[PDB]
């Protein structure tokens, strides 16, 4: 069942290179032998501007199962981020990234990355994944945005 997947990831790639949103990165990693790993991607998401996430470029890895595209990718921030919906392991907690929920095989890698970027400044109250970020986000948002700006500055080239 890897054929439909490797092909699909391959439809994702050239469409991405031909046209993709500005400041976004999505690149399949490369094997030591000299082949291409389509099941594993190194991606980057830019912070929206007018926000505390601004000037920031935040790196995440995308992993695809063999039954892709009927299963969603596993999206993990490396390094892990300070966000209410991001686990200490860097895993992203999103509704469209889980199969029994709002995942569709029609969902593009672009749509995923955009949804996560949207999630950056719009945390979901119903998906606590990180204790510190969630609690501070609710309690004192000024201080929360303080942390976000420091983190954004840390990942600005």
């Amino acid at each position: 069942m890897s054929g439909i997947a490797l092909s699909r990831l391959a439809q994702e790639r050239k469409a991405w290179r031909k046209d993709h949103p500005f400041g976004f990165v999505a690149v399949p990693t490369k094997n030591p032998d000299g082949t291409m790993n389509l099941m594993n991607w190194e991606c980057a998401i830019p912070g929206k501007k007018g926000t505390p996430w601004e000037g920031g470029l935040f790196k995440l890895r995308m992993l695809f199962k063999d039954d892709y595209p009927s299963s969603p990718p596993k999206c993990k921030f490396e390094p892990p981020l300070f966000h209410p919906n991001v686990y200490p392991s860097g895993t992203v907690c999103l509704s469209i990234l889980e199969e029994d929920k709002d995942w569709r095989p029609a969902i593009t890698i672009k749509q995923i990355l955009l949804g996560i970027q949207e999630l950056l400044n719009e945390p979901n109250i119903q998906d606590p994944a990180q204790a510190e970020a969630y609690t501070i986000y609710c309690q004192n948002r000024v201080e929360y945005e303080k942390r976000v700006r420091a983190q954004a500055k840390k990942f600005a080239p």
């Binding site: 490797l6 092909s7 391959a10 031909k18 094997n31 000299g34 082949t35 291409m36 790993n37 389509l38």
Partner: protein, 109 residues
Amino acid sequence: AEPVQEELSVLAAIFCRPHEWEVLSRSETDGTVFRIHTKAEGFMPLELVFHLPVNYPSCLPGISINSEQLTRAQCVTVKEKLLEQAESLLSEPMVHELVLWIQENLRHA
């Protein structure tokens, strides 16, 4: 060239057979020659040998079809026509597209 070598890598990945894929030759001049067998038929078995000169994809690739479940008379039609949307997908890595274009297709429909 970056687009080309990325295409080569992707093709080498898409196929994880045993005898899928091979790079027949590499060179600064004349370019790269490789072979793929991709399998298709269900009713009324393909070897495609692509040559990528250093001008591809701005230029046309050299192709050749062997498929002795099929006759040979078609291979001239099929090479002189896998050539077409090769001219449509011109200026960009087209190999993957052609490959998956023809297990859809045996000059069908």
